[PDB]
Structure formats: C-alpha cells, structure tokens
Amino acid sequence: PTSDDIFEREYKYGAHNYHPLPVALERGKGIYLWDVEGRKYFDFLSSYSAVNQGHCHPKIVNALKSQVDKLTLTSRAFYNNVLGEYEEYITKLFNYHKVLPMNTGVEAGETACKLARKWGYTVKGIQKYKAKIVFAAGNFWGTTLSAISSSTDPTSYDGFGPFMPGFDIIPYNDLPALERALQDPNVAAFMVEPIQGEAGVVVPDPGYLMGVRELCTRHQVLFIADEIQTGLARTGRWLAVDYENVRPDIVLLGKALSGGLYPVSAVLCDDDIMLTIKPGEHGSTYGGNPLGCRVAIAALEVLEEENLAENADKLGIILRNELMKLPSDVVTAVRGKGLLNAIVIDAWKVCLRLRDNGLLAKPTDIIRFAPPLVIKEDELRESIEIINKTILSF
Amino acid sequence: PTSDDIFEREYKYGAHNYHPLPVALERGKGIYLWDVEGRKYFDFLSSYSAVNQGHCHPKIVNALKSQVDKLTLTSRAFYNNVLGEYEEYITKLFNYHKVLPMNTGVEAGETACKLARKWGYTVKGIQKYKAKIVFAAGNFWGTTLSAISSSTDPTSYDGFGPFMPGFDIIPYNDLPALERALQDPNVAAFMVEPIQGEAGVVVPDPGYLMGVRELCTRHQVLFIADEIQTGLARTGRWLAVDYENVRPDIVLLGKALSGGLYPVSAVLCDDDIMLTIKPGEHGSTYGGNPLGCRVAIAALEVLEEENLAENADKLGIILRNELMKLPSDVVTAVRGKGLLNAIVIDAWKVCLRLRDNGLLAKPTDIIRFAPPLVIKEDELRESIEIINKTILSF
Ligand SMILES: *Cc1c(COP(=O)(O)O)cnc(C)c1O
Ligand SMILES: *Cc1c(COP(=O)(O)O)cnc(C)c1O
Incomplete structure (x- = not known):
C-alpha cells in the first residue's frame, strides 16, 4: 500500500485520538526510519523518547x-x-x-x-x-x-x-x-x-x-x-x-x-x-x-x-549551540538538556517541510528535537543542516 | 538458581503486591509449564486467560x-x-x-x-x-x-x-x-x-x-x-x-x-x-x-x-460434568461456560497439593479451572484425574 492508502485505512477503521504527521513508516534501524515509498529520514522524536537506544x-x-x-x-x-x-x-x-x-x-x-x-x-x-x-x-x-x-x-x-x-x-x-x-x-x-x-x-x-x-x-x-x-x-x-x-x-x-x-x-x-x-x-x-x-x-x-549518557551530553551541547545561530526573528528560544531539546517558532508547517527534507519531528509553536542517543556527531551535524535548510527556506 | 532462591530474590528486590503460589516456572509450551527443577505441570490458570492459544x-x-x-x-x-x-x-x-x-x-x-x-x-x-x-x-x-x-x-x-x-x-x-x-x-x-x-x-x-x-x-x-x-x-x-x-x-x-x-x-x-x-x-x-x-x-x-471456540465449548461440558461427580460434601458448587470454570471448596491447601500432583491453579474458597483452549480431550481427562486424586486425598 501507498502512503495515502495507509492514511485512509486508519481514518476509516481507527479512532481519531491522534492527528499524526502525514508520513507512513515501515522500517527503522538506529537513528533512521524509512517510509513505504522507500525514503529515508532522521528520527528526531525517538517515539517520545522510547527509542533512546535506536530502533531495533x-x-x-x-x-x-x-x-x-x-x-x-x-x-x-x-x-x-x-x-x-x-x-x-x-x-x-x-x-x-x-x-x-x-x-x-x-x-x-x-x-x-x-x-x-x-x-x-x-x-x-x-x-x-x-x-x-x-x-x-x-x-x-x-x-x-x-x-x-x-x-x-x-x-x-x-x-x-x-x-x-x-x-x-x-x-x-x-x-x-x-x-x-x-x-x-x-x-x-x-x-x-x-x-x-x-x-x-x-x-x-x-x-x-x-x-x-x-x-x-x-x-x-x-x-x-x-x-x-x-x-x-x-x-x-x-x-x-x-x-x-x-x-x-x-x-x-x-x-x-x-x-x-x-x-x-x-x-x-x-x-x-x-x-x-x-x-x-x-x-x-x-x-x-x-x-x-x-x-x-x-x-x-x-x-x-x-556510554549513551555521555554521548547525549556532548552532542546536546553541539545541537543547542548550532540551533542558537538560527535567526532570533524566526526561532525565539532554544532549550533542553542532553538530547531532549526544543525550539520555539507555524510549527506544523515547519515539520511538514522538515519531513520533505528528510527529518521527522512533531510540534507540541514548539518543535521538539530528540534523536536517538546512538547518533554520531557527523550524523547530528548533517541533521542540523536539514533544520537550517528548512528554517531558512521560509 | 533453585526455586527457593527465586522466591527469596523476588522477596528482597520486588514489591509484595502478590503472594504467588510457590512454584517457579522457566518454560511453557501449549498447555504445559515446567519449573526450574524440570517438573512438568498442566496450566489451569492460563495466565488469567491470556494464553488461550497456549504458551509460545x-x-x-x-x-x-x-x-x-x-x-x-x-x-x-x-x-x-x-x-x-x-x-x-x-x-x-x-x-x-x-x-x-x-x-x-x-x-x-x-x-x-x-x-x-x-x-x-x-x-x-x-x-x-x-x-x-x-x-x-x-x-x-x-x-x-x-x-x-x-x-x-x-x-x-x-x-x-x-x-x-x-x-x-x-x-x-x-x-x-x-x-x-x-x-x-x-x-x-x-x-x-x-x-x-x-x-x-x-x-x-x-x-x-x-x-x-x-x-x-x-x-x-x-x-x-x-x-x-x-x-x-x-x-x-x-x-x-x-x-x-x-x-x-x-x-x-x-x-x-x-x-x-x-x-x-x-x-x-x-x-x-x-x-x-x-x-x-x-x-x-x-x-x-x-x-x-x-x-x-x-x-x-x-x-x-x-476452531478454539468450538473446542472450549465441547471440552467445557466434559470438565463440568466430571467435576460435578466430586463429593458434594467437599466441593459445594461447579460453574462456568466453555473453559472458564470454578469449583467452590482451604482452597490454598488444595492448590498446593494440585501443584504437587502436576497441575497449577490459584484460588480467588474458590478454585478456578481455566486451561489453554488448545487442550485435547485426553489431556483434559488426565488433568481431571489429578483434580480427583487431589480432592479425594483429603
Ligand atoms: C508519556 C509519559 C507518561 C505516560 O506514559 P505512557 O506510557 O504513554 O502511558 C508519563 N510521564 C511522562 C513524563 C511521559 O512523558
Ligand atoms: C484483568 C482484567 C482487567 C484488567 O486487565 P489488566 O491487563 O490486568 O490491566 C479488566 N477486566 C477484566 C475482566 C479482567 O479480568
């Protein structure tokens, strides 16, 4: 099934207690998720912090x-x-x-x-x-x-x-x-x-x-x-x-x-x-x-x-420091500890475009940035550029 | 570890919200459970009716x-x-x-x-x-x-x-x-x-x-x-x-x-x-x-x-019919539908001896008899004789 088919089938047979971001995933491994069309994404929600160790x-x-x-x-x-x-x-x-x-x-x-x-x-x-x-x-x-x-x-x-x-x-x-x-x-x-x-x-x-x-x-x-x-x-x-x-x-x-x-x-x-x-x-x-x-x-x-605590500490410092370079006129605040972070900005439109650019996040005017703790610095820096491309495309 | 070791370790490090029957299981398949000493048991609780399909x-x-x-x-x-x-x-x-x-x-x-x-x-x-x-x-x-x-x-x-x-x-x-x-x-x-x-x-x-x-x-x-x-x-x-x-x-x-x-x-x-x-x-x-x-x-x-509904129906009739032959002076009532059944009798001592005779049940003066629905008639009739041996040994 295609992505739209997946959305429509849940709409028919499942309760409407969620309005998910329109992306349909079929596989995950470490920091990455893939949708049914085969596109690859950085996971920056980590299933509300349940896949700290990475997927599977x-x-x-x-x-x-x-x-x-x-x-x-x-x-x-x-x-x-x-x-x-x-x-x-x-x-x-x-x-x-x-x-x-x-x-x-x-x-x-x-x-x-x-x-x-x-x-x-x-x-x-x-x-x-x-x-x-x-x-x-x-x-x-x-x-x-x-x-x-x-x-x-x-x-x-x-x-x-x-x-x-x-x-x-x-x-x-x-x-x-x-x-x-x-x-x-x-x-x-x-x-x-x-x-x-x-x-x-x-x-x-x-x-x-x-x-x-x-x-x-x-x-x-x-x-x-x-x-x-x-x-x-x-x-x-x-x-x-x-x-x-x-x-x-x-x-x-x-x-x-x-x-x-x-x-x-x-x-x-x-x-x-x-x-x-x-x-x-x-x-x-x-x-x-x-x-x-x-x-x-x-x-x-x-x-x-x-040593995922230590990695989350070190990489969280890098993440917040780079997010702070985003224009104050667009991103009003950056906050977090370790790899539990958020920016203040709508946020839904931002997340749709992050998705288009290969990174999955969800709003809670606040966008949470929480990748698995097994992420490496180069992967994090690649993710940060997607956030930059997206924010700076508006 | 031995069974007593297992009881003692949970007693030290786990909350006391349960008082389990003193048996320590390590494997289950279909209607059977085995303890750490290697003894085999009929499961007549089915984990409160969660293993209808049998274990594993x-x-x-x-x-x-x-x-x-x-x-x-x-x-x-x-x-x-x-x-x-x-x-x-x-x-x-x-x-x-x-x-x-x-x-x-x-x-x-x-x-x-x-x-x-x-x-x-x-x-x-x-x-x-x-x-x-x-x-x-x-x-x-x-x-x-x-x-x-x-x-x-x-x-x-x-x-x-x-x-x-x-x-x-x-x-x-x-x-x-x-x-x-x-x-x-x-x-x-x-x-x-x-x-x-x-x-x-x-x-x-x-x-x-x-x-x-x-x-x-x-x-x-x-x-x-x-x-x-x-x-x-x-x-x-x-x-x-x-x-x-x-x-x-x-x-x-x-x-x-x-x-x-x-x-x-x-x-x-x-x-x-x-x-x-x-x-x-x-x-x-x-x-x-x-x-x-x-x-x-x-x-x-x-x-x-x-066709486990049909099996549970047919075998439940047999189970209740045989339990009704137990002495009215010891077993006061038999009730149930399909393979959700109980007898009214203490019940804890009865279950300790059922365990000794190879069948696991738990009281809730009421003893529940609820084996997995994949049980066969000969297995059920063998179980019934354990119940009979146990009840008639008092
Ligand atoms: C999600 C969450 C809960 C509830 O957890 P569920 O497993 O979703 O029921 C409790 N506390 C905090 C901080 C949470 O984030
Ligand atoms: C056990 C039980 C529940 C609660 O189920 P849990 O998974 O233990 O929380 C609710 N209804 C009935 C009839 C039950 O037997």
Missing part, C-alpha cells in the same frame, strides 16, 4: 527472540525465573530497595499515587481520605481519569469529568509556591518532572530540584520524580535528577526501559514506602512478565555499555 | 520475530504500515466501525469510561459534570484509582481514597436493579462482565444480557461489555455475549488478544461513540505499535483457524 537495537532484539521461545507470560499468580533477576539488577542500578513492575508510564504514575496515599494514611497518619497529592502546572503523566484530573491542559480534561479529588496544582519551577503548598499537613506527595516533556521541554532553574528535595524532606512529603521521559540517558545523565545530585522517594521509569520493543514501566522506592502495599492490593496481568523483563535488562545494559 | 504458540512467535527485525515503535505521532491493517481486520471481525488501541486491560476500561462521559455530555446532553457510570458488585477491571473506585472488594480500594466520583454500583445478575438505576437521566453507561472472572466465575442467569441490552437501549445508556477475560473463545464463543446474541455499544478486549506475547488491548465501538474523542484528547505511547499489532493479528487468526 540488535542486543535488545536478540534478548526478545531468545526469551520468546522459552516463556512469555505466567502472570504473577506463579513465579518465573526472569523477574527477580531483573528486579535485582534494576534496584541496584538506581539504588532503591524494591521495584514494582508495570507496563505503561501512566500505570507507573497511578501506582505511585496509590503508594503515596497508602503511605500517607498508614505511616504519616493522615486521616482517611484527606491525603493530597501536589502536581505542577504543565505536568503530563498519561491519559487515565486520574492523570487528566491533575492536568492543566484543557485538551486533556475538558469534557471528561467529574475529576479525581485530592489533587492540587502549583506552578512549575517555583519553590515558594511549593513551600506554601506544603504547609498543608495532609499533603502526602509532590509529583514532578525534572524537565517537562510534553509541555515543550520546560527546563526548571538550577537549584529547583535541590529545593524540592529539601522542602519535601522538611515537611515529610514524598518526592515523586517522573523520569519516564527524562530518564535513561536522554538528558545526559542516568536520571535527569542526577544533575542536582538529588534522590527522590519514588522514581518512575518507562518508555526507553525497553528500547521500544515492549511496554515496560517501573516504580522504584525503598521498603518504608513500597511495603505499604500488601498482597492482593495492586495487580496487573502483564506487569513483571519474563519477556518484557529480558528486554528491559538488555535495554538498560545497552545504555550503560555504550 | 509458534504462529504468534513467528509474527513477533518477523516484525521485530523491521520496526517496533514509531509512536502515533507518525503512521506505520501495520496499525491500519490490524484495525481493519479486528473491526470487521467483531463488526464495529472503529477500534481504539491501548496496551493493558485497565487502559481499555479507562478509555471506555472517557468515551462514555464524553458521549454523555456531547451527544446525550448530560450537563457537565453530572454523568454517571453504573457498575455491578463484584466487578474487576484493573487497579488504577478509577478502577478501584468502582470495586466492591475492600482489598482493592480500602486505604487508597478519596475515590473517583460519578460511579454507582448495583448487584450483578439483577435486571430490576438495573432498571431502577437507569431511571436516573444522568447515567451515561453501564459497564459489566458477561461472566465475572476475578469474582470467582460468577455466571449470570439466562436472559440477563438480553435484559441489559434492552434496558440500556430503552433508556439511551451505553452498554459497555468487558470481555477482556471472557472473550476470544474462552467461554466457547468468540465473545461470551454471543451466547445471548447481544451486541454491546462498546466491547473491551485484552489478555489473549496477543496470546500472552505482548500487552495489547482494544476498545471497539461505532463512529457515533468513538468520534466523540478528537485528536489530542487520548494518548498512549505504546498503544497501536506495529509489533503488538502483528502479534495480535496472528493471535486472532489462531483462534479462528484452530
């Missing part, structure tokens, strides 16, 4: 192909041989006692909210059901009814109420607002992204995450760090929170935890939080399955073995 | 191995060549206009609730935010904050509030209660399982689903059928609702939609419901990815090509 990374592929012949799903009604090996590996990597395995990023966020409330009631001693969770304006952590209840984007929540109670919102990047909010003794947790991704790569000021950690500790509130997009080398560190040497109470991972080969998400925290949830209190059919666990071990090993 | 079905495995070398995740920011082919296939199979792809069963349920509310406000004309959704006591559809808010199991919701408003509960298998509930003009939907699985294989009376359909139509309420566990040949029909020739407004599928090789879930409904959700209003990173889509096509083709 052979080590992760090999892990999938090995385990799929053995065993793919027991459910957690029984034990399998893989899960505990993955749990020991990942908990030691990030230095938390335990992990709770789930499948999608929003599932990890839901899990963290349950953890926070159960901890609020049974350890902090908040009365049922007065526990509150604080969120930052611009947050994105998924599309469930709980997740849209904390959103400040009307596209997410308008028309879908009534909303989950017990969720408060303050501005991002704002320590006085957090301090004022945590005067309320019924707050159990503050959940926040170290860099807000879907909001448009909003980078907070130096010292913000240090201040969050101090304030949360000072008021005995759990600091939930959502690293589903910012984590796993994307910003030039293992976790973006590492830039300020801050240790959250709960860390969320997803997306690139599998290199894009399987939906695997993780909730990391110590025993004093994790063991508030008892047997039977939190279930998921596929969470912790052995196929996804093998895939995730390999996906994490790739990030470590190939 | 070669056709589904081959689909996974083929696509993983090509392309695994673009995100829905762009098109890929696989998704629309899967969408056209599945919508025609069940005769709905469109499908909305998600990953887990609870994600499909969350999606249906958003659909119902958005439809309630914009098509039925309910005022914001007075839309209600009705659920049945005993329902299970996942572990998110919205899903536990409609539960009547205190293990699920106690300690996790405050709860999602707008959710009402009535008894299962109760047409007068549904009629009374739907006198409220702000109900947008009634969500119900055709057979309640996690509640203990609670089978409603003949005519219940016919009565639900009539009542929902009479009062312009959406009938949401949760077939994530009962669907896909498990009960001896494509959908359990087919036993009463009833067509819901929204059908949920999950679990066996992938044969256990990938978390794939589906929301099926016609354009008058589905198109209430617009671009940007409902997102999921992995939903609709091409790897899961290839896997699901193959998983569905297996159910059709191997």
Whole structure:
C-alpha cells in the first residue's frame, strides 16, 4: 500500500485520538526510519523518547527472540525465573530497595499515587481520605481519569469529568509556591518532572530540584520524580535528577526501559514506602512478565555499555549551540538538556517541510528535537543542516 | 538458581503486591509449564486467560520475530504500515466501525469510561459534570484509582481514597436493579462482565444480557461489555455475549488478544461513540505499535483457524460434568461456560497439593479451572484425574 492508502485505512477503521504527521513508516534501524515509498529520514522524536537506544537495537532484539521461545507470560499468580533477576539488577542500578513492575508510564504514575496515599494514611497518619497529592502546572503523566484530573491542559480534561479529588496544582519551577503548598499537613506527595516533556521541554532553574528535595524532606512529603521521559540517558545523565545530585522517594521509569520493543514501566522506592502495599492490593496481568523483563535488562545494559549518557551530553551541547545561530526573528528560544531539546517558532508547517527534507519531528509553536542517543556527531551535524535548510527556506 | 532462591530474590528486590503460589516456572509450551527443577505441570490458570492459544504458540512467535527485525515503535505521532491493517481486520471481525488501541486491560476500561462521559455530555446532553457510570458488585477491571473506585472488594480500594466520583454500583445478575438505576437521566453507561472472572466465575442467569441490552437501549445508556477475560473463545464463543446474541455499544478486549506475547488491548465501538474523542484528547505511547499489532493479528487468526471456540465449548461440558461427580460434601458448587470454570471448596491447601500432583491453579474458597483452549480431550481427562486424586486425598 501507498502512503495515502495507509492514511485512509486508519481514518476509516481507527479512532481519531491522534492527528499524526502525514508520513507512513515501515522500517527503522538506529537513528533512521524509512517510509513505504522507500525514503529515508532522521528520527528526531525517538517515539517520545522510547527509542533512546535506536530502533531495533540488535542486543535488545536478540534478548526478545531468545526469551520468546522459552516463556512469555505466567502472570504473577506463579513465579518465573526472569523477574527477580531483573528486579535485582534494576534496584541496584538506581539504588532503591524494591521495584514494582508495570507496563505503561501512566500505570507507573497511578501506582505511585496509590503508594503515596497508602503511605500517607498508614505511616504519616493522615486521616482517611484527606491525603493530597501536589502536581505542577504543565505536568503530563498519561491519559487515565486520574492523570487528566491533575492536568492543566484543557485538551486533556475538558469534557471528561467529574475529576479525581485530592489533587492540587502549583506552578512549575517555583519553590515558594511549593513551600506554601506544603504547609498543608495532609499533603502526602509532590509529583514532578525534572524537565517537562510534553509541555515543550520546560527546563526548571538550577537549584529547583535541590529545593524540592529539601522542602519535601522538611515537611515529610514524598518526592515523586517522573523520569519516564527524562530518564535513561536522554538528558545526559542516568536520571535527569542526577544533575542536582538529588534522590527522590519514588522514581518512575518507562518508555526507553525497553528500547521500544515492549511496554515496560517501573516504580522504584525503598521498603518504608513500597511495603505499604500488601498482597492482593495492586495487580496487573502483564506487569513483571519474563519477556518484557529480558528486554528491559538488555535495554538498560545497552545504555550503560555504550556510554549513551555521555554521548547525549556532548552532542546536546553541539545541537543547542548550532540551533542558537538560527535567526532570533524566526526561532525565539532554544532549550533542553542532553538530547531532549526544543525550539520555539507555524510549527506544523515547519515539520511538514522538515519531513520533505528528510527529518521527522512533531510540534507540541514548539518543535521538539530528540534523536536517538546512538547518533554520531557527523550524523547530528548533517541533521542540523536539514533544520537550517528548512528554517531558512521560509 | 533453585526455586527457593527465586522466591527469596523476588522477596528482597520486588514489591509484595502478590503472594504467588510457590512454584517457579522457566518454560511453557501449549498447555504445559515446567519449573526450574524440570517438573512438568498442566496450566489451569492460563495466565488469567491470556494464553488461550497456549504458551509460545509458534504462529504468534513467528509474527513477533518477523516484525521485530523491521520496526517496533514509531509512536502515533507518525503512521506505520501495520496499525491500519490490524484495525481493519479486528473491526470487521467483531463488526464495529472503529477500534481504539491501548496496551493493558485497565487502559481499555479507562478509555471506555472517557468515551462514555464524553458521549454523555456531547451527544446525550448530560450537563457537565453530572454523568454517571453504573457498575455491578463484584466487578474487576484493573487497579488504577478509577478502577478501584468502582470495586466492591475492600482489598482493592480500602486505604487508597478519596475515590473517583460519578460511579454507582448495583448487584450483578439483577435486571430490576438495573432498571431502577437507569431511571436516573444522568447515567451515561453501564459497564459489566458477561461472566465475572476475578469474582470467582460468577455466571449470570439466562436472559440477563438480553435484559441489559434492552434496558440500556430503552433508556439511551451505553452498554459497555468487558470481555477482556471472557472473550476470544474462552467461554466457547468468540465473545461470551454471543451466547445471548447481544451486541454491546462498546466491547473491551485484552489478555489473549496477543496470546500472552505482548500487552495489547482494544476498545471497539461505532463512529457515533468513538468520534466523540478528537485528536489530542487520548494518548498512549505504546498503544497501536506495529509489533503488538502483528502479534495480535496472528493471535486472532489462531483462534479462528484452530476452531478454539468450538473446542472450549465441547471440552467445557466434559470438565463440568466430571467435576460435578466430586463429593458434594467437599466441593459445594461447579460453574462456568466453555473453559472458564470454578469449583467452590482451604482452597490454598488444595492448590498446593494440585501443584504437587502436576497441575497449577490459584484460588480467588474458590478454585478456578481455566486451561489453554488448545487442550485435547485426553489431556483434559488426565488433568481431571489429578483434580480427583487431589480432592479425594483429603
Ligand atoms: C508519556 C509519559 C507518561 C505516560 O506514559 P505512557 O506510557 O504513554 O502511558 C508519563 N510521564 C511522562 C513524563 C511521559 O512523558
Ligand atoms: C484483568 C482484567 C482487567 C484488567 O486487565 P489488566 O491487563 O490486568 O490491566 C479488566 N477486566 C477484566 C475482566 C479482567 O479480568
């Protein structure tokens, strides 16, 4: 089938919850994607930061192909041989006692909210059901009814109420607002992204995450760090929170935890939080399955073995420096850490022409530039010239 | 590692949200599982009905191995060549206009609730935010904050509030209660399982689903059928609702939609419901990815090509008939449709001894008996004798 045929078939038989950029891909490998006409493209979205390791990374592929012949799903009604090996590996990597395995990023966020409330009631001693969770304006952590209840984007929540109670919102990047909010003794947790991704790569000021950690500790509130997009080398560190040497109470991972080969998400925290949830209190059919666990071990090993944090750091400096040379009259701002970057400009027309010139990006007047972390400098510099050609063609 | 080593390692590094039956599996194929000591077992849980096609079905495995070398995740920011082919296939199979792809069963349920509310406000004309959704006591559809808010199991919701408003509960298998509930003009939907699985294989009376359909139509309420566990040949029909020739407004599928090789879930409904959700209003990173889509096509083709509905029907009759010969003094009840069955009996001690005798089951005083649908009569009769040996050894 042709590209238009592909667009039309989805239009007929699939829900219209997305309006994708009109490009139809059939193969991907490393930093590249090819459409059905055979044209090649640089991938500068990385599937919302899930293919940090590049598309179809052979080590992760090999892990999938090995385990799929053995065993793919027991459910957690029984034990399998893989899960505990993955749990020991990942908990030691990030230095938390335990992990709770789930499948999608929003599932990890839901899990963290349950953890926070159960901890609020049974350890902090908040009365049922007065526990509150604080969120930052611009947050994105998924599309469930709980997740849209904390959103400040009307596209997410308008028309879908009534909303989950017990969720408060303050501005991002704002320590006085957090301090004022945590005067309320019924707050159990503050959940926040170290860099807000879907909001448009909003980078907070130096010292913000240090201040969050101090304030949360000072008021005995759990600091939930959502690293589903910012984590796993994307910003030039293992976790973006590492830039300020801050240790959250709960860390969320997803997306690139599998290199894009399987939906695997993780909730990391110590025993004093994790063991508030008892047997039977939190279930998921596929969470912790052995196929996804093998895939995730390999996906994490790739990030470590190939020094992708260091590459993302070095190449991100080059990327932002060159984007800053774009005319201030057309590109109003450049921002990012590592290889999570964006420019401010419409943005859709820009992305259509980037596509024409061989580079795939999507707007979120903001264009995100997030290639896989396995990109090399010469490939990055070639990509930058496509961005320049495109911006300078208007 | 030994079995005890496996138990201890998960105990140290993994959350305690499950207390699994103490058996440690490393391989599965068809109806069988093997533990790390090499012992072989009949699987009578089928991973909560996700391996209807049997473990590691070669056709589904081959689909996974083929696509993983090509392309695994673009995100829905762009098109890929696989998704629309899967969408056209599945919508025609069940005769709905469109499908909305998600990953887990609870994600499909969350999606249906958003659909119902958005439809309630914009098509039925309910005022914001007075839309209600009705659920049945005993329902299970996942572990998110919205899903536990409609539960009547205190293990699920106690300690996790405050709860999602707008959710009402009535008894299962109760047409007068549904009629009374739907006198409220702000109900947008009634969500119900055709057979309640996690509640203990609670089978409603003949005519219940016919009565639900009539009542929902009479009062312009959406009938949401949760077939994530009962669907896909498990009960001896494509959908359990087919036993009463009833067509819901929204059908949920999950679990066996992938044969256990990938978390794939589906929301099926016609354009008058589905198109209430617009671009940007409902997102999921992995939903609709091409790897899961290839896997699901193959998983569905297996159910059709191997006549597993018919096998589950015929063998389920044999299974229930033999279980009914167990002493009334020990087994108080037998129930089920197709190969979703249970007996009422503690049940944990029974399952420990079934395990000792080569058959794996889990309690939910209720023991579920749900082997893969590819089981043959001689294998089933051999399994039945293990159940007999075990029950009669007490
Ligand atoms: C996408 C995203 C989520 C939700 O992840 P899904 O896997 O799409 O459900 C949560 N948090 C952040 C920061 C995200 O970017
Ligand atoms: C398990 C289940 C769900 C939830 O599915 P997950 O994939 O575990 O989230 C929903 N509905 C029913 C009937 C189920 O059995």
